[PDB]
Amino acid sequence: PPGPFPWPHLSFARLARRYGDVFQIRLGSCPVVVLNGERAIRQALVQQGAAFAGRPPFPSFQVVSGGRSLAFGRYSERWKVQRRVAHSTVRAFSTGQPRSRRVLEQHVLGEARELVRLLVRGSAGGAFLDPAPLTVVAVANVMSAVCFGCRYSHDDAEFRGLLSHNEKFGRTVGAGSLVDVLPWLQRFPNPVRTAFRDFQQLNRDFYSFVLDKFLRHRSSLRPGAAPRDMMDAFIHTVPRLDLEYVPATVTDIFGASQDTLSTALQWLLILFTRYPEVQARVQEELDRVVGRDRLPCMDDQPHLPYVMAFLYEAMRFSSFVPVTIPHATTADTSIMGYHIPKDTVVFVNQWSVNHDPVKWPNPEDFNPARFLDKNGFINKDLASSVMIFSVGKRRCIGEELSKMQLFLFISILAHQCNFRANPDEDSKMDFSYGLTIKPKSFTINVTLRST
């Protein structure tokens, strides 16, 4: 592999155009490999998936979910069991339990209507507002209903703690990651360390919060009649797994859906405002198939080719998850002719797959018609090649869950309201990097619409 190069996610694409699809970088102490091409990634993660299905052993990882995290657990024989049930259980709720689709669809509807309420009221007359704090609230409330059944009221005190948990979490994860590349920072006092502690105590305070919900759920109506929410489904579905694994995976299912689905909606909104033509086409397609007397539902998703095309290309354009969770090699392997030793950290650049000019002819241009190939004038299945949920054995287990969720959100948001940009904000979607690519602070005006 090309020798370690010294110094965002765009920098990785700069070196791939010059030093090859695969190369090494020095991250302080640890050396790391980078995969940038769809060829180098599909090869490593799909073909040789079992070889790249590992995670680095980091300080940030273990405290999460009480050292039993699915997202940060090492590749092990018991981990494989943790995923199989985790993937199967979550798949059960999103699609397959006609009830869970309903129980989920009800929770998405409810919070989605609360969203247009607070969005319109906040834009009374000609007022503009920042939708970022509303998207995080809608995401946190919905996922609480999926994990714990109870969809709290926005003023509920316990719900205020969840919101307060996500904030500090996203604000201190940076320190938790700095220790992973600068482990000596813990050898003396400094602000990063003082923050790393706050991050580790957070995942303890929050795991106990979820462990409680588990106990109070377990010793409650146990005929097995129906899973109220994700918690029961995990209990019903239980090498051997310690019973403590059920709440450990739910702590990940919650923490995972937060920052991404929020950013997802933030992009879907700021895009409606910067491209009013496509917003119209989206708006036309809902009135034509669904009508004006009822709200959209999932059973219309097949009959809504453009709405999803807008979704799939919003994910491609933003690529708000530019780099996946760092992988580690399970054994020695070779990719593109290079030797790869074991226990080596390897990043996966999803941004390079979504902006490779050969694949996507005009990469930096927002055009949802890509996934609509007019010869059939129906949605084309190229979406599967959009890299945002990753690939292989560590791919997101909530892919088919967040697709329905987001589909129901923008379809309700666009079926009821008209999103206008702010004329003073200089257009030009400016990005805020780190975690996921959130669009830097913006404001929009949301008004109802008629037909």
Ligand X SMILES: C[C@]12CC[C@@H]3c4ccc(O)cc4CC[C@H]3[C@@H]1CC[C@@H]2O
Residues in contact with ligand HEM by CB under 6 A are 70-71, 83, 90, 252-253, 256-257, 260-261, 264, 321, 324-325, 348, 388-390, 394-398, 401-402
Say if CB 32 and CB 24 are below 8 A apart: yes
Q: What's the min distance (Å) between Cβ of 285 and ligand HEM?
A: 22
Q: Compare residues 256 and 290 and give the one whose CB is closer to ligand X.
A: 256
Q: What's the min distance (Å) between Cβ of 146 and ligand HEM?
A: 7
Q: Compare residues 15 and 325 and give the one whose CB is closer to ligand X.
A: 325
Q: Compare residues 65 and 100 and give the one whose CB is closer to ligand X.
A: 65
Asked if 325 touches ligand X (CB under 6 A), the answer is yes
435 binds, among ligand HEM, ligand X, none (CB under 5 to 8 A by kind): ligand X
Is the backbone of residue 96 left (phi > 0), alpha (psi -120 to 50) or beta?
A: left
Q: Which residues lie across from 431 on neighbouring strands?
A: 439
Asked if 435 touches ligand X (CB under 6 A), the answer is yes
Q: Compare residues 298 and 348 and give the one whose CB is closer to ligand X.
A: 348
Q: Compare residues 234 and 272 and give the one whose CB is closer to ligand HEM.
A: 234
Checking 228-232 for CB contacts under 8 A at 24+ apart, the result is: 228/103, 228/149, 229/103, 229/145, 229/146, 229/147, 229/148, 229/149, 230/89, 230/90, 230/93, 230/146, 230/147, 231/147, 231/148, 231/149
Asked if 71 touches ligand X (CB under 6 A), the answer is yes
Q: Compare residues 83 and 359 and give the one whose CB is closer to ligand HEM.
A: 83
Asked if 162 touches ligand X (CB under 6 A), the answer is no
264 binds, among ligand HEM, ligand X, none (CB under 5 to 8 A by kind): ligand HEM
Considering only 63, 304, 321, 335, the residue that binds ligand X (CB under 6 A) is: 321
Q: Compare residues 311 and 421 and give the one whose CB is closer to ligand HEM.
A: 311
Taking the C-alpha atoms of residue 35 and residue 12, their distance in angstroms, rounded to an integer, is 9
Considering only 22, 40, 44, 64, the residue that binds ligand X (CB under 6 A) is: 64
Considering only 21, 229, 252, 285, the residue that binds ligand X (CB under 6 A) is: 252
* Nearest C-alpha neighbor of 282 from the set 414, 416, 377: 414
Residues for the chain: how many in total? 451
Q: Which residues bind ligand X (CB under 6 A)?
A: 64-65, 69, 71, 252, 255-256, 259-260, 321, 325, 435-436
